[PDB]
Design a protein around this ligand. Structure first.
Ligand SMILES: *[C@@H]1O[C@H](CO)[C@@H](O[C@@H]2O[C@H](CO)[C@@H](O[C@@H]3O[C@H](CO[C@H]4O[C@H](CO)[C@@H](O)[C@H](O)[C@@H]4O)[C@@H](O)[C@H](O[C@H]4O[C@H](CO)[C@@H](O)[C@H](O)[C@@H]4O[C@H]4O[C@H](CO)[C@@H](O)[C@H](O)[C@@H]4O[C@H]4O[C@H](CO)[C@@H](O)[C@H](O)[C@@H]4O)[C@@H]3O)[C@H](O)[C@H]2NC(C)=O)[C@H](O)[C@H]1NC(C)=O
Ligand SMILES: *[C@@H]1O[C@H](CO)[C@@H](O[C@@H]2O[C@H](CO)[C@@H](O[C@@H]3O[C@H](CO[C@H]4O[C@H](CO)[C@@H](O)[C@H](O)[C@@H]4O)[C@@H](O)[C@H](O[C@H]4O[C@H](CO)[C@@H](O)[C@H](O)[C@@H]4O[C@H]4O[C@H](CO)[C@@H](O)[C@H](O)[C@@H]4O[C@H]4O[C@H](CO)[C@@H](O)[C@H](O)[C@@H]4O)[C@@H]3O)[C@H](O)[C@H]2NC(C)=O)[C@H](O)[C@H]1NC(C)=O
Ligand SMILES: *[C@@H]1O[C@H](CO)[C@@H](O[C@@H]2O[C@H](CO)[C@@H](O[C@@H]3O[C@H](CO[C@H]4O[C@H](CO)[C@@H](O)[C@H](O)[C@@H]4O)[C@@H](O)[C@H](O[C@H]4O[C@H](CO)[C@@H](O)[C@H](O)[C@@H]4O[C@H]4O[C@H](CO)[C@@H](O)[C@H](O)[C@@H]4O[C@H]4O[C@H](CO)[C@@H](O)[C@H](O)[C@@H]4O)[C@@H]3O)[C@H](O)[C@H]2NC(C)=O)[C@H](O)[C@H]1NC(C)=O
Ligand SMILES: *[C@@H]1O[C@H](CO)[C@@H](O[C@@H]2O[C@H](CO)[C@@H](O[C@@H]3O[C@H](CO[C@H]4O[C@H](CO)[C@@H](O)[C@H](O)[C@@H]4O)[C@@H](O)[C@H](O[C@H]4O[C@H](CO)[C@@H](O)[C@H](O)[C@@H]4O[C@H]4O[C@H](CO)[C@@H](O)[C@H](O)[C@@H]4O[C@H]4O[C@H](CO)[C@@H](O)[C@H](O)[C@@H]4O)[C@@H]3O)[C@H](O)[C@H]2NC(C)=O)[C@H](O)[C@H]1NC(C)=O
Ligand code: NAG
Ligand code: NAG
Ligand code: NAG
Ligand code: NAG
Ligand code: NAG
Ligand code: NAG
Ligand code: NAG
Ligand code: NAG
Ligand code: CA
Ligand code: CA
Ligand code: CA
Ligand code: CA
Lengths: 388, 388, 388, 388
């Protein structure tokens, strides 16, 4: 009932524990479950919820054929109860569009959807279930945003937007919103060459986003935002542990202010928790495809260009598919510190499972533990052959 | 918790932005979605909802065969959450009948359903979920009303009703209700010849309805109601930009107090926002059928008989079906002014898609923007061939 | 938040208007709708709801075969939102059993289910969602109760129970409950010979029940209960307009304290509103079967043995099936007087539609109007042939 | 809004009455009902709910094939409304795992799920919908817990956990939690040799659990916990009325501090209400398999090794399947004393109904009565042959 403020630091992450899992495509083989992709999680002061971009069809209905394509007029941002499947009967529609981000400021929720032709898109900013501000395309080539939650501090919620090429220079701007109104916006600054799909968190009055360079880095770019002064900077994560996909093998030394060369023009959304010695990175196991997922503790990843792993935990084995991953935390949980959390999208269907005509996914999510806990793997679990 | 009062004027409409879309018949190909028609939207102080007249069947159930017919004992007014499909499991029934209107007065909701044989129908007025007043047929030939929301000011909610022929003179009365009780009623006055299906809004303590002359105008009639003094007047929109369907081509000069001749005995429900220089009109693109939809800014449409378009925005392309359209606004949104909004029904099935035995529809809805935003088209999106 | 008291008299009933209709078996041809029978309606201070005894199956599931039988361990009292179908996903279970009654006292709800073998049944009295009192069989042959709502006055809610033969003398007791505890009980008194299935209402601190004599009256028995003094009396409705089914034709003179002879050992549950000149009776049109339904104004029916109809209204035409009917009113509606209401069960399936293996029903319900409104007929509306 | 305290003693149990029944597999033959096992019931201050471990599939979906296996990554603790089926659309997920226990302390709910490989499992303790404490495996062979509700007194909720062999000595610890944090833990003490699956209740500031010795007793072990002093003791129920399954026939004398020999290495979860002369025991009728269920009053069962039955009540007949059974009570019900209650799992599918490829169950539950009520039997009621 007053605005949240990032007062705490992160707890120490000694391992990760299961937080949510919806088993969507299993249950979707015989229930009215919606086809989705681009998932995230976001909390409110009294409940956390699962989020995604619908495709306007059930998995087993005939309009599922073709849902590999990303933008169209039938997609919408939807949220459902934690660890339930996105079902026709139990989902809330937030706004209409094919790209999105959402966060609670402590009083109410802000949600952003973007819709349009490639060359004439727009974003409209919803605050307390109502349309309030609208922005139109500035560079005229797919105005897109985070695909996971934003973070607010005392009313200001910064969002990163990118408009222009995915294959060369683009135009990225950080917008600072308070109650749906634009307070100010800046263009991208610092040394990062290209920004797409930022995964963000906040602690001790500072916001950290780990993003996706699609043009040329296999190492990830980092934007650090100050919500009071409303300024930002960018860098790349120095560590030679590379974390985009596809990517070349890991080198011995890495790069702090330049992209690491090797693959060009493709990527995946990812995250990291950058906190000195208490720094963990997530990545696909495969260097060629989005398959397998693992967490690795690389002390001082951001600042040391020779930093190797000290500890790890496998989340999805290499034989199963992963997809986008992103950060969230529950800033309304009781405690001295913020507990870190993430999610991994588990895509099933096309492109890799060519025997079906659709593309959908489930979620698995995880939070930290100060305890050193044993691990298990968390695969989607459907058998594609039942859908034939 | 006290009655709403129309205190504000309209914002300036420089373009329109997507507000809601339910993709009902797509999802209805494999979910328990109800067959409907005659949709509208209506807000409460804390949520806006989608509304329609059910047919008492799912799209894919066998009693869908025959739902082209308009009146029967299995239809009911239902409402569901914004941008969800009218599903068996998620709909609230408001009252039983085949014609309806509904509005919130700031304390609670008033809903009107009408049921009967053609020659012996009645309306019962529900207020705060209970039956309170009942009116019986006066001219004995299909007592019908708005098919979209009414508007209240300090407790008085005027509704327009028509009883009698659709093909010659009829008997139309404006009723003023306060808390479900009739304060007064008048017969239609001014110069409009025939009234059917009024789409209404209010601003600065005045209510404007744009209606449908079914007997002989291709230009639309306008009733202006004063909720304090409880009086009204009618006219036609002077502009030569004609907006009923079917209609002849646009002339050079139009008609303020007479119907424009050309087509006879048929029409569609429509709306306009009549606000001096800030006047927008909606219409089908086809002059022969309900296909395509577009918004056009015609400054001073109501009062100037030579007024041509200054700006426009295509909402549905000509190759896709449209249907009824109607006004709504959210009089409980924060702001200095009322933001204008509308919806378009997108009918699928019979008469035009003769290969199926049913008739159902989806909704797309839109609100204003002071920004000049790019456009996209918003078609239903189902493929009829999947239902064969 | 304090106990309701029957302060008002009835309004004048000049005609009846549609109140609720769920179209259950139509929508049940392709939705997860439960098989039911024995329906009623009952209001709470803030919403009215539909009630019935489930059979533990959907209409289209295979355990529907056999649901003609009345008692078994898979039946339960369930309630759902007004004018919705009894669906798997939207129903609340109240208590487990094959006979039931329920009423709100103004603070919370009392519900009674009965379960057992024929010779060893029991009733348990639920108050504010919890078990509180239990009664066991006294005459050891199907302990049964109202199958529609009870009525409370200042905390006392009388219920009529019958244990013993349906084909000769039985043992009927009126129990007076306050907050789930038994204050007192009496055996049946006055002149009525046999009591089954009472339909009750209250006005001006008195409760009236019209019941079913199954042994030998084609005229109905009436119990009048005083909730303060906790006493009762019985009589039969004097009028020669006979209202049980099956029944012989109407005579010229009727019987006040004896059953009218003609048919023996069978009946249907029914009701009447007995209020001097403002007295209305409901009945099947067919004298042989539960088909058609109509309301008839017979002034002074209770007390005059030569009273003929003055006005009427057809509710269901003779060509369609009806079933049980029962009274309810909304004692929390605003007004100077209690508005009368009823429901009719519309049974479909066996015995009469022998081509299917199941038995289920829908509801239509109606309330009074001081206006003289036109009528329509309200049939179930499913086509049995779609279920083959 | 303050912590519950066990202030009352038990009421006298003179018979048992139906409390809840969900008929899940009947309705599951044609609805989206989840496959489950290991059920229980647990109350909150304002509603009681049904609980179970999901398998991540509907009964009629193809991933039902194989659900006989107990642990996997697709299981979760779920709760639904009392006497409804575990449906996709109406279930709340509590935490992810294949073993669980849950209880309300009067302020909010505590829930524990366990997940892992056999040799590397962990438990995470949820309090007020959030992760708070995590424990890791101590003996490295299936860390498991109660499979029914825990009981709190003034904030302390003791839970029994077992880690190690089911076929020899294991390592069992009683943990005392207050608001999700561990106050203290002890290892098992007293004379019981092996503990698995405790069914617990509390009265007059003491908690009683009746558990399962899997290694070698056909008589059940009892742990008595003091929540203030945080200590416990164990014994076996002296009575010669044996209550595990499988078991040898009943002897003439039984054993208070040693297991009764006869069967080795297998069992079922069960309960008892141990209250001097007012002591009731539940058991399967079959000595070879989980089929039939009955309640028997054996005065002083715990303390007398020659105690025979005085009264009984059959709950499920021998020809039908039963499964796990467990205690619950509603410590927020109005009254002078705690009313005792239990549930029985009714397993259908494999191992015994080998003609289907799945394993699922329904619930029947019961509470006490001071009245001597007649009995009925409460079987699952599905016909397996409809699933072929
Ligand atoms: C019970 O549960 C517990 C708790 O989970 C289990 O204990 C955990 O076990 C894990 C598996 O052993 C272990 O995870 C590994 O940790 C290593 C860290 O240990 C090192 O440092 C510590 C401290 O100094 C020492 O104790 C230890 O000896 C080691 O020195 C990581 O090194 C591991 O990650 C690497 O291996 C995996 C595959 O095994 C790779 O997928 C991963 O990417 C890492 O390896 C690649 O990357 C590094 C860094 O660049 C390269 O140098 C290396 O060559 C690899 O490079 C190739 O591969 C990548 C991807 O394929 C590619 O991109 C690149 O180009 C190359 O091709 C791993 O994280 C946990 O730390 C441990 N936890 C605890 C608390 O102990 C226990 O086993 C369970 N079971 C039982 C029975 O108890
Ligand atoms: C990115 O997004 C932006 C934002 O949406 C896009 O920009 C918009 O582009 C629209 C399409 O060009 C444009 O809409 C048109 O606007 C015209 C208004 O412009 C005129 O006035 C302004 C100011 O003076 C001038 O700048 C301009 O030069 C023009 O003079 C309207 O005239 C257009 O409507 C008419 O055309 C459409 C078909 O194109 C018809 O369907 C419509 O009914 C109108 O035409 C009929 O009616 C008129 C009036 O009677 C007749 O005179 C005419 O002959 C037509 O009559 C026949 O047709 C009707 C129906 O079929 C029939 O009933 C009748 O009998 C006849 O048969 C149209 O509204 C937007 O204004 C513009 N917005 C902005 C902010 O700039 C941009 O393109 C996007 N794309 C890219 C790559 O950026
Ligand atoms: C528009 O809507 C309006 C509003 O609804 C419509 O107006 C209504 O029209 C109804 C149909 O005409 C009418 O209902 C009838 O009312 C009669 C009452 O009228 C009499 O009294 C008044 C006042 O004195 C006079 O004005 C009038 O002239 C009459 O004298 C009832 O008599 C009618 O009920 C009887 O007929 C129906 C069949 O038509 C039977 O089913 C019913 O059971 C009644 O008849 C049986 O029972 C009586 C009494 O015992 C017997 O005497 C008789 O012989 C019948 O007995 C056989 O049948 C029963 C059952 O089958 C069986 O058990 C028995 O043994 C025998 O076999 C009927 O109720 C409304 O009153 C009228 N309302 C108003 C406000 O005016 C209007 O039509 C609509 N349409 C249009 C175009 O406007
Ligand atoms: C209407 O409803 C009412 C209310 O429910 C019905 O009344 C109830 O009727 C029940 C059935 O008769 C009755 O239940 C039985 O109660 C016996 C207690 O009675 C004895 O003591 C009282 C007081 O002294 C006396 O009045 C009476 O004469 C008796 O002496 C129990 O003994 C019964 O349980 C035993 O029988 C059943 C089968 O019938 C077994 O399944 C059960 O396990 C018990 O028997 C086994 O165990 C005992 C103890 O070890 C052995 O000694 C015995 O040999 C059996 O052992 C074999 O079987 C077990 C399991 O198969 C196996 O493990 C073992 O190794 C051996 O193989 C039973 O509980 C209720 O008490 C009575 N209630 C009331 C209030 O009166 C009424 O009938 C209904 N119907 C009508 C028409 O009214
Ligand atoms: C956040 O900080 C502002 C002042 O900077 C203060 O008013 C507000 O109460 C703080 N937030 C909360 C949740 O206390
Ligand atoms: C999917 O669509 C393509 C054309 O877009 C068609 O060839 C294909 O057969 C469809 N798949 C199925 C299962 O119908
Ligand atoms: C509407 O006007 C009346 C007096 O005309 C006033 O009492 C009421 O409070 C006004 N409405 C609101 C929402 O303030
Ligand atoms: C629809 O109904 C007509 C008769 O009303 C029948 O001829 C037609 O075949 C039906 N359509 C279907 C698909 O059964
Ligand atoms: C009913 O009557 C009692 C006294 O007889 C009174 O306390 C109570 O308030 C009355 N009911 C209501 C709703 O006022
Ligand atoms: C219903 O059950 C009977 C036996 O009880 C059986 O003969 C009949 O064929 C069943 N009906 C259907 C449709 O299976
Ligand atoms: C439980 O006992 C504590 C003190 O031991 C007391 O504060 C608390 O209020 C008691 N519980 C309730 C529900 O009163
Ligand atoms: C279940 O799975 C087994 C192999 O795990 C397979 O042989 C069997 O046929 C399956 N059952 C069904 C009905 O498909
Ligand atoms: Ca890249
Ligand atoms: Ca016209
Ligand atoms: Ca009779
Ligand atoms: Ca054992």
């Amino acid at each position: 009932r007053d605005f949240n403020n990032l007062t705490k630091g992160l707890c120490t992450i000694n391992s990760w524990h299961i937080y949510g899992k919806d088993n969507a495509v299993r249950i979707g083989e015989d229930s009215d479950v919606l086809v989705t992709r681009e998932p995230y999680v976001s909390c409110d002061p009294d409940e956390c919820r699962f989020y995604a971009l619908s495709q306007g069809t059930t998995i087993r209905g005939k309009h599922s054929n073709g849902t590999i394509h990303d933008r169209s007029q039938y997609r919408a941002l939807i949220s459902w109860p934690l660890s339930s499947p996105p079902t026709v009967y139990n989902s809330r529609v937030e706004c209409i569009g094919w790209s999105s981000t959402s966060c609670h400021d402590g009083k109410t929720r802000m949600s952003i959807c973007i819709s349009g032709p490639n060359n004439n898109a727009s974003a409209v900013i919803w605050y307390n279930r109502r349309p309030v501000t609208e922005i139109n395309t500035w560079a005229r080539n797919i105005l897109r945003t985070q695909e996971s939650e934003c973070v607010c501090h005392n009313g200001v919620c910064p969002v990163v937007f990118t408009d222009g090429s995915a294959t060369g220079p683009a135009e990225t701007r950080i917008y600072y919103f308070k109650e749906g109104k634009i307070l100010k916006w800046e263009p991208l600054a610092g040394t990062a060459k290209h920004i797409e799909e930022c995964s963000c968190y906040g602690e001790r009055a500072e916001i950290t986003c780990t993003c996706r360079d699609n043009w040329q880095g296999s190492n990830r770019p980092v934007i650090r935002i100050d919500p009071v002064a409303m300024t930002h900077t960018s860098q790349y994560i120095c560590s030679p542990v590379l974390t985009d996909n596809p990517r070349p093998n890991d080198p011995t030394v890495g790069k702090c202010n330049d992209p690491y060369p090797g693959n060009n023009n493709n990527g995946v959304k990812g995250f990291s928790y950058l906190d000195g010695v208490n720094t963990w990175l997530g990545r696909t196991i495969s260097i060629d495809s989005r398959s397998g997922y693992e967490m690795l503790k690389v002390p001082n990843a951001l600042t040391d260009d020779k930093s190797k792993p000290t500890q790890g935990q496998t989340i999805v084995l290499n034989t199963d598919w992963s997809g986008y991953s992103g950060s969230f935390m529950d800033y309304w949980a009781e405690g001295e510190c913020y507990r870190a959390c993430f999610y991994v999208e588990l895509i099933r269907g096309r492109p890799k499972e060519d025997k079906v005509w659709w593309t959908s996914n489930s979620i698995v999510s995880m939070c930290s533990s100060t305890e050193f806990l044993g691990q298990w793997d968390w695969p989607d679990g459907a058998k594609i052959e039942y859908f034939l």
